[PDB]
Amino acid sequence: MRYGHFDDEAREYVITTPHTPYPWINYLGSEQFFSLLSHQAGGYSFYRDAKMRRLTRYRYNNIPADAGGRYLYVNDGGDVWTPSWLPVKADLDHFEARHGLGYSTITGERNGVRVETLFFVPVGENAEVQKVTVTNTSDSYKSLTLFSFVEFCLWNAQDDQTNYQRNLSIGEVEVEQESPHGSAIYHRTEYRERRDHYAVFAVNTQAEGFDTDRDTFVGAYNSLGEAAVPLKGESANSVASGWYPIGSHSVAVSLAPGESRELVYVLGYVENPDEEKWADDAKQVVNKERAHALLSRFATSEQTDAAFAALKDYWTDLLSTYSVSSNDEKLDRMVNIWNQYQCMVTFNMSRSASFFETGIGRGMGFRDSNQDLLGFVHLIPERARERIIDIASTQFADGSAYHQYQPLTKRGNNDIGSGFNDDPLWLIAGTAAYIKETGDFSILDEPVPFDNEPGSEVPLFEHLTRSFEFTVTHRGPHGLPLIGRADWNDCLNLNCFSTTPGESFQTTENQAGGVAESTFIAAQFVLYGEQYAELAARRGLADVADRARGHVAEMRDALLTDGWDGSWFLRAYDYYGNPIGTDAHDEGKIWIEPQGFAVMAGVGVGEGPQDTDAPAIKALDSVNEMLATDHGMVLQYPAYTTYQVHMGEVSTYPPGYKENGGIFCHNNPWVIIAETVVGRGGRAFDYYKRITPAYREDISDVHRLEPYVYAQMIAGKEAVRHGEAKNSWLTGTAAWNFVTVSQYLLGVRPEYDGLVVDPQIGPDVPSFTVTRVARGATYEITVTNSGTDGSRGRLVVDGTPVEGNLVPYAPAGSTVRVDVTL
Amino acid sequence: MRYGHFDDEAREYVITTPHTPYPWINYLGSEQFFSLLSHQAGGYSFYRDAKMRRLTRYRYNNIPADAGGRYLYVNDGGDVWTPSWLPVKADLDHFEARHGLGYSTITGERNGVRVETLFFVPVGENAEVQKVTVTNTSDSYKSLTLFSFVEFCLWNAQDDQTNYQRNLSIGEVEVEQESPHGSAIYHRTEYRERRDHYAVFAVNTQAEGFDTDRDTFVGAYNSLGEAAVPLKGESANSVASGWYPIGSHSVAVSLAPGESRELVYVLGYVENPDEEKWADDAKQVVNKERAHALLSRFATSEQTDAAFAALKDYWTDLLSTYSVSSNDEKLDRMVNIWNQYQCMVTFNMSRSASFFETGIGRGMGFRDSNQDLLGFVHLIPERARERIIDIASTQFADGSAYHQYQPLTKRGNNDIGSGFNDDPLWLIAGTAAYIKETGDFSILDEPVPFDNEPGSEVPLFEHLTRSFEFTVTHRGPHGLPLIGRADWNDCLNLNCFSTTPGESFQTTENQAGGVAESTFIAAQFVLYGEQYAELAARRGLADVADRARGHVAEMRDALLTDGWDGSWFLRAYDYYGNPIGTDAHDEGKIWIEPQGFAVMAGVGVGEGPQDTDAPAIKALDSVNEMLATDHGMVLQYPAYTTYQVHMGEVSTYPPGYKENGGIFCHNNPWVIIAETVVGRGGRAFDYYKRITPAYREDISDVHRLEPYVYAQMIAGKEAVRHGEAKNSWLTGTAAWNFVTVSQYLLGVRPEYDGLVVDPQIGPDVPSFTVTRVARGATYEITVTNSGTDGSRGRLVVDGTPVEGNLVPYAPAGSTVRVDVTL
Ligand SMILES: OC[C@H]1O[C@@H](O)[C@H](O)[C@@H](O)[C@@H]1O
Ligand SMILES: OC[C@H]1O[C@@H](O)[C@H](O)[C@@H](O)[C@@H]1O
Ligand SMILES: OC[C@H]1O[C@@H](O)[C@H](O)[C@@H](O)[C@@H]1O
Ligand SMILES: OC[C@H]1O[C@@H](O)[C@H](O)[C@@H](O)[C@@H]1O
């Protein structure tokens, strides 16, 4: 069953019941200011840093989940309710929430009163803005008191929740009932201290009253759903002095039948230059100039409406780079709208804040930066370019890099340090793609430091060389790369050997040496080894290139021998050299990562889909028989039922969950592409459909999480909860699925010397057109598709039949028409 | 107004309403296993380590506060309620909660049904046990279904609340409906991996049904107060697979009028040897032997009742060391019962967990270990002795020590390291007191390592020498000890100079050198310098002693000159040698720490209370005019109204809170004693009364926190919330107040060569007897007291008038009678 439906025209998902299987959130804000917003108005806002600069408080593991948010308590003749349904849970005659691009509306009607709220963060604005519309839809008169509600976080969220001995005493506000454009509350905790910023909560009309103390507003022994002030019908005008500060105003609205009222609220993040902090000599009153300026900017519905439409323009113009038209409206909505939206969010948010990720840790995987870039680089190339240079500057001079990178500080994480031997090659993956997309080889010439050390700068290409050579000099007895702490799979820790709860599986190493090898880094070395060879060759470094090709060929040999178990690739070699991922064993006979990434790199690919002796085909057939379920392909099988001390975290998970038999979506697109590579488009589109939001909307009660975005993890076949997802939104599944549907199924992928036009999607999408803007030009690609295994497209270019699958990059401002037949 | 009353004969505080100003908790367990228990049954349990080994989940900053705990949902013919009132909040005909020593009872009656629950942790047991008694007090028949409720924490509480990406997938249970003695649930999260321990939740009767999944028991979009299973009237028999695991059973009870039912529940922490973890070969089923054994131990009311009484015996026998009988029952109840109880708790719990301290950080201040010891050393000398040796082993070879000590690991905290130059002398304060109490000078001969380094062991006395000499070699231009990062006052950071939110005020040092001095360490050096001199001299090290006396005399000189502002002592010298705590300034003219500790050490004490030119009297008169309020003495005055970058954290607090103008109770007993020293007992007893639980019970609505225990912080005169407390229970206020009332007001303090009998309490306690057991002997001390300033007691010993105030230590098993006249 479903709990809403897609509104393609509006570019929205519309949730028609407050009773979802789990809270479904949206992301607001696209620059420095962000918001988490559920269909019930829960979650929070933060500027830049979701740990140190969080404006509002949100409790993970609340009972019930999503119990606090931005609330507008309606008091209608004594009866108190909220349009978000929660916290109050009053019977609503109508409820609807619409999640769109950088905004959401929530609407509730009860007893002849309808409240619509537009939530969004404006462009060029560090503020969450609420446009409220109250409509008397009854035949009688209405006289209402509306109580707005926000609960503040004391900025640093880790502290706010763990350091009560200090922080129950530092809460401070200022109250400005007669604000230039209405009424406003200032949460200024620690502005007295080292903070040069405060928060503002305001409404563009004169408030009847207010409240900044949470215990006075809500009452003792009261849940948000029973708050005392709204039931009383009148604000308590509480002034906070420590404890829990809130933003709250009462607004009086009288309405004839059919008559409506519009109100605008702003949640703002205001900073001041250090010298400009105080309005007064005594340094007690905050300087509110900038806060008034922001509030002058949203004093009217007309202003607000314009900021909104502008936001709509931003996103409208942003998503013009790639779109498709098909028989299949689910594919269309994913390719054009929801998958691209999700990829921008992963860029803007990294892995900081989610209903699952708790926003306390500020870091993000070096490997995750790089994979994420592949999904948004067609949208924001100049930004992408700047990202590639940021992360590459933290790279150690020996080729390794920090396993985690801080986007806010643009520095590697020292505490975690290095050691994950797949991390380095990921920088090549990022560079190569960025350049194929833009043709900006100039970046390779850009100066980049090692470990952010001034005067150590070398051309970026030399960094790729460090990354390439790192694997060459760190191989094991079989010639496969040493795994180090882990490869892509963080829970594969072969140098951990831990028996002590609370030691870090990824960092702690209880045995010093060993020979642990990974087939996945091997496959990655062949794949991104050849991309590096391509870049060195074009660069004019022919000697370096042929030589790197030489290593790549060596790794290709190793995989197909020491890396091959007979019907699929081994996953790794352990500390003592015994194989991992072999049919000889009982559990973890087969792992998905090396099967997909290795065939992604042509290793084992024979003559065709018919070449069933081709290892790549044996592997892919093994992946189908042993790992693929209706819900996606599981990570390995069988899952580990007892703890394997030699293998780190992977076996600490119960069968069917996460890295132990979970369906890790991130790595499924690897098999999908591998399937287009070997020439089985139908099987590739099948797999892609099994894990894609649009196609899972029907089984929402199983999925639980948002039907519009990818989640990291869907419980595998050995979990009772199979089909159930966790960890939605922030995941490399987005980037890799976009790259899969856009470049391999649809078949439109940038190359250095032109645009490949190679569709591989199977019979289920017989016809489609792709519109893409590449190098200033627009290509219109009209595909007629039998979808037959091993059929590749013939291009007709601008009315003239051509040979091969590459289309030459036309000049900027050009329109090229490409006819493809499969 | 009050919310209960003291029950002295039961040794309990009884809270007669569920509607306290704030949740009032108790501590259960006295060995390895502890529980936090509010008057509403909220809080949690943990074994040893409140961070890594926490059995049950508790949310700080819940709305409303205290919303989850151990709940027994009563379903009486459809009407669902709880005896703890919360979560459900059903109208109760009767409610009462009684907090006693290591146990509590909670009782609720609604519609002819009464449920009494005895909560306690048994001696020699790692388990919280609940004795439930259901009594049909109506004239009609009753048929009830009781639903027990516990919500598990996934052991590591920091992880459990921040690592959802991993931990929403690792929740596991086992359900045993037919347990040897009833029904039991096993929470075994991560037992699959590195944990050798699980938890058990059971009832000594056959359960009708069960539930281990929180979302099924409580329901979607439901608060604990609305849980779905109890409303339904029947358990859902949920099996937890990830998400949130709970312990819950339904029990069917039918009752004729007047007839009652008794049920026993156990919350248990069961470990297994590594080789004994599994009942099965497949290693899937937990070995429940030890869990069954524990449950066999509490299968009956008779067993339970005996464990209870034994617990009562433990505490009855434990608090036999010191008691007083007086006209004043509040003094009596504090001296005999509540103050002594609180001191044991600080020992057992350190600073790990309370409703204000969040149990995530495992550490405790080195200085706090030492001061705490002074309050419980008469109770548990052998343990104390072991503590003194534990902390002293982490001390660096140069005299400094870790500022924080881990009691569980018996290791100094490395991350925080050293630098707080008052910390070292605190080890002398601990040793000297322990030895005066016991006469065990043998400890001074004990081998102790520096920084836990094998082979570095030196006699303990040498450690005291390191501590003594550390101050001698770390003095400033005026001859006062360099403050380092801070002295006792952690928020006095003179080498911080920070302007960056999130830098640690106590550790980060933005300026390398300076000359910051502290008068408080100076006073501490004179006080504990002379104790050290006494110990070296007795030890036979005459040269070392006279020499240390020499330094002590030098420090005395410095304080009364470079340390004296005219009418009180300066607080310190800053980084650039400018005074802090001087009448020349506008804010922080006077600080309390150096006034009390310095006169505690006789610095400035003249001829008598009449000697008004004596600096000690000027200082103490200054403390009275400028710092003392009806609620206690404030920390400094006036409080800082703007941030002082040169002074660290102290000024980040708003006036009247914590270290900036808050009433820090810990340091008030310093002035109180200093007042008995100068000979003003009435003023000393006045001050003591202003901050003591028994005497504040009347103004509970102001205090807010528990009226039976000391809190760390009462808002000072410049806070609007003046009179309001925070941070109850875990504080050095307990130790120091006990030492104040027991040794200085009442006047009974151990010395090396005998027992001083020197009362100084003022007119308000005209007569009292003290019963003290010291060195195996019992002293009965009968005081007749005019309470006149400057009157000190004349001892008559065993019928014979004697001279001076010292009574010779009689042999073990003796009874000495001491008559005192004042
Ligand atoms: O780190 C512990 C310290 O935190 C500071 O913020 C508090 O003001 C102080 O009372 C406490 O000792
Ligand atoms: O464990 C597999 C993957 O897990 C993800 O949670 C991490 O972000 C990613 O870096 C890793 O490759
Ligand atoms: O450190 C982040 C990692 O945490 C592990 O517990 C998870 O299994 C893995 O998916 C994730 O990448
Ligand atoms: O800050 C003053 C006091 O604060 C307490 O929290 C610290 O534990 C104690 O060491 C210090 O003396």
Q: Is B368 in the pocket of ligand 4 (CB under 6 A)?
A: yes
Q: Name the 3-class secondary structure at A489.
A: coil
Query: How far away, in angstroms, is B668 Cα from ligand 4 center?
Result: 13
Q: Which two tokens stand for residue A127?
A: 């503020």
For B456-478, letters b (16+ CB in 10 Å) and e give: eeeebbebbbbbbbbbbebbbeb
- Residue A576: is it exposed, middle or buried by C-beta count within 10 angstroms (0-12/13-18/19+)? exposed
Alpha-carbon distances of A320 from A324, A337, A771, rounded to whole Å: 11, 10, 9
Q: Please state whether A704 falls in left (phi above 0), alpha (psi between -120 and 50) or beta.
A: left
Contact A147, A75 (CB under 8 A): yes
The beta strands (E) that lie in A396-492 are given as: 404-406, 411-412, 447-448, 458-459
Between 3.40.50.300, 1.10.3720.10, 1.50.10.10, 1.10.10.10, what CATH number should domain A329-680+711-745 receive?
1.50.10.10
* Cα–Cα nearest to B4, from B71, B153, B104: B104
Which contiguous run of DSSP H or E holds residue A258?
none
Q: How far apart are CA B97 and CA B14, in angstroms?
A: 6
Query: How far away, in angstroms, is A320 Cα from ligand 3 center?
Result: 35
Specify the residue with its C-alpha closest to ligand 4, atom 3: B489
Q: How far apart are CA A464 and CA A428, in angstroms?
A: 6
Contact B262, B106 (CB under 8 A): no
Specify the residue with its C-alpha closest to ligand 3, atom 6: B166
Q: In this structure, which topology does domain B1-271+700-710 adopt according to CATH?
A: Beta-galactosidase; Chain A, domain 5 (2.70.98)
Q: Is B488 in the pocket of ligand 4 (CB under 6 A)?
A: yes
Outline where A238-380 has alpha helix (H): 289-297, 301-318, 329-333, 339-349, 366-376
> A161–B224: do the CB atoms touch at under 8 Å?
no
Alpha-carbon distances of A420 from A77, A401, A474, A505, rounded to whole Å: 63, 8, 12, 12
Residue type, B697: E
> B169–A223: do the CB atoms touch at under 8 Å?
no
CB contacts of A654 in chain B (<8 Å) are 169-170, 172, 192, 241-242
Helix, strand and coil percent figures for chain B, each rounded to 5: 30, 25, 45
Question: CA-based angle A232:A236:A240, to the nearest 5?
Answer: 140
Specify the residue with its C-alpha closest to ligand 3, atom 11: A490
Q: How far apart are CA A190 and CA A422, in angstroms?
A: 42
Q: How far apart are CA A41 and CA A71, in angstroms?
A: 7
> Can B332 be counted among the known catalytic residues?
no
Q: How far apart are CA A443 and CA A385, in angstroms?
A: 8
Alpha-carbon distances of B821 from B746, B758, B801, B815, rounded to whole Å: 13, 10, 11, 20
Which contiguous run of DSSP H or E holds residue A508?
none
Residue type, B349: M
Q: Which of A62, A168, A221 to mutate to test the interface with B (most CBs of B within 10 A)?
A: A221
Which contiguous run of DSSP H or E holds residue A777?
strand A777-784
* Cα–Cα nearest to A104, from A30, A32, A25, A48: A25
> A241–B156: do the CB atoms touch at under 8 Å?
no
Question: CA-based angle A356:A360:A362, to the nearest 5?
Answer: 105
| Alpha-carbon dihedral angle through residues A545, A548, A550, A552, given to the nearest 10 degrees | -130
* Cα–Cα nearest to B156, from B51, B68, B6, B23: B51
Q: Is B490 in the pocket of ligand 4 (CB under 6 A)?
A: yes
Q: Is A489 in the pocket of ligand 2 (CB under 6 A)?
A: yes
Q: Which of B490, B565, B574, B758 is catalytic?
A: B490
Atom of ligand 2 nearest to the CA of A491: 1
Q: Which two tokens stand for residue A85?
A: 């349904």
| Partner-chain residue, chosen from B190, B220, B727, that has the shortest CB–CB distance to A652 | B190
DSSP-derived letter for residue B667 is: G
Residue type, A209: G
What is the crossing angle of helices B460-473 and B542-560, to 10°? Answer: 40
CB contacts of B18 in chain A (<8 Å) are 221
- Residue A222: is it exposed, middle or buried by C-beta count within 10 angstroms (0-12/13-18/19+)? middle
Atom of ligand 1 nearest to the CA of B659: 8
Q: How far apart are CA A223 and CA B63, in angstroms?
A: 5
**Beta bridge mates, A103:** A100, A120
Distance of alpha carbon A320 from the chain centroid = 20
Q: How far apart are CA B51 and CA A174, in angstroms?
A: 37
Distance of alpha carbon A367 from the chain centroid = 14
Active site residues of A: 490
> B89–A221: do the CB atoms touch at under 8 Å?
yes
* Cα–Cα nearest to B397, from B475, B340, B453, B328: B453
Residue type, B417: G
CB contacts of B241 in chain A (<8 Å) are 654, 719-721
For A133-169, letters b (16+ CB in 10 Å) and e give: bbbbbbeeebebbbbbbbbbbbbbbbbbbbbbbbbbb
Q: How far apart are CA A431 and CA A425, in angstroms?
A: 10
Atom of ligand 2 nearest to the CA of A727: 6
Method: X-ray
Query: How far away, in angstroms, is B525 Cα from ligand 4 center?
Result: 18
Distance of alpha carbon A521 from the chain centroid = 24
Specify the residue with its C-alpha closest to ligand 1, atom 6: A166
How many C-beta atoms lie closer than 10 Å to residue B503's C-beta? 14
Q: How far apart are CA A336 and CA A316, in angstroms?
A: 11
Residue type, B748: V
Contact A402, A394 (CB under 8 A): yes
Contact A485, A420 (CB under 8 A): yes
* Cα–Cα nearest to A488, from A669, A705, A726, A688: A669
Nearest CA distance, A281 vs chain B (angstrom): 11
Specify the residue with its C-alpha closest to ligand 1, atom 12: B490
Query: How far away, in angstroms, is B493 Cα from ligand 4 center?
Result: 13
Q: Is A368 in the pocket of ligand 2 (CB under 6 A)?
A: yes
Phi/psi of residue A105, each to 5°?
-115, 145
Specify the residue with its C-alpha closest to ligand 2, atom 12: A488
Q: Is B367 in the pocket of ligand 4 (CB under 6 A)?
A: yes
Half-sphere exposure of residue A417: CA atoms within 13 angstroms, side-chain side: 8
> B222–A63: do the CB atoms touch at under 8 Å?
yes
Q: Name the 3-class secondary structure at B799.
A: coil
Q: Which ligand is nearest to the CA of A350?
A: 2
Query: How far away, in angstroms, is A165 Cα from ligand 1 center?
Result: 7
CB contacts of A164 in chain B (<8 Å) are 60-61, 356-358
In the structure, how many helices (H) and strands (E) does chain A have? 21, 43
* Cα–Cα nearest to A702, from A780, A803, A615, A632: A632
Contact A814, A777 (CB under 8 A): yes
CATH class of A272-321: mainly alpha
* Cα–Cα nearest to B401, from B380, B377, B425: B425
Return the number of CB contacts < 8 Å for A and B: 185
Q: Please state whether A589 falls in left (phi above 0), alpha (psi between -120 and 50) or beta.
A: alpha
> B161–A161: do the CB atoms touch at under 8 Å?
yes
Task: Encode A797-822 in three state secondary structure.
Answer: ECCEECCCCEECCCCCCCEEEEEEEC
Q: Which of A63, A727, A729 to mutate to test the interface with B (most CBs of B within 10 A)?
A: A63
Residue matched to tokens 């008004």: B612
Q: How far apart are CA A806 and CA A143, in angstroms?
A: 68
Nearest CA distance, B643 vs chain A (angstrom): 6
Residue type, A355: F
> A63–B63: do the CB atoms touch at under 8 Å?
no
Query: How far away, in angstroms, is A407 Cα from ligand 4 center?
Result: 36
Report the chain A residue with the minimal C-alpha distance to residue B155.
A501
DSSP-derived letter for residue A39 is: T
| Partner-chain residue, chosen from A164, A194, A225, that has the shortest CB–CB distance to B501 | A194
CB contacts of B652 in chain A (<8 Å) are 170, 190, 192-194
In the structure, how many helices (H) and strands (E) does chain B have? 21, 43
Residues 6+ apart with CB under 8 A from B420: B367, B403, B484, B485, B486, B487, B490, B506
Query: How far away, in angstroms, is B342 Cα from ligand 1 center?
Result: 21
Find the distance separating the first CA and the last CA of chain A, reported in whole Å.
36
Q: Which ligand is nearest to the CA of A413?
A: 3
- The string of DSSP codes covering B543-563 is HHHHHHHHHHHHHHHHHHTTT
Q: Is A422 in the pocket of ligand 2 (CB under 6 A)?
A: no
Q: How far apart are CA B190 and CA B208, in angstroms?
A: 29
Handedness of CA A455, A458, A460, A462 (dihedral sign): negative
Contact B662, B634 (CB under 8 A): yes
User: What does CATH list as the number for B322-328+746-822?
Assistant: 2.60.420.10
The beta strands (E) that lie in B408-501 are given as: 411-412, 447-448, 458-459
Ligand 3 pocket, mutate which of A491, A498, A508, A730 (most atoms under 8 A from CB) = A491
Nearest CA distance, B282 vs chain A (angstrom): 8
Nearest CA distance, B540 vs chain A (angstrom): 46
Alpha-carbon distances of A278 from A173, A179, A268, B716, rounded to whole Å: 14, 17, 18, 26
Residue matched to tokens 């990059």: A809
Domain regions of chain A by residue span: 1-271+700-710, 272-321, 322-328+746-822, 329-680+711-745
* Cα–Cα nearest to B812, from B772, B776, B773: B776
DSSP-derived letter for residue A731 is: S
Outline where A68-171 has alpha helix (H): 157-162, 164-167
Which contiguous run of DSSP H or E holds residue B542?
helix B542-560
| Partner-chain residue, chosen from A164, A221, A643, that has the shortest CB–CB distance to B60 | A164
Query: How far away, in angstroms, is B45 Cα from ligand 4 center?
Result: 26
The beta strands (E) that lie in A425-523 are given as: 447-448, 458-459, 517-518
Which contiguous run of DSSP H or E holds residue B370?
helix B366-376
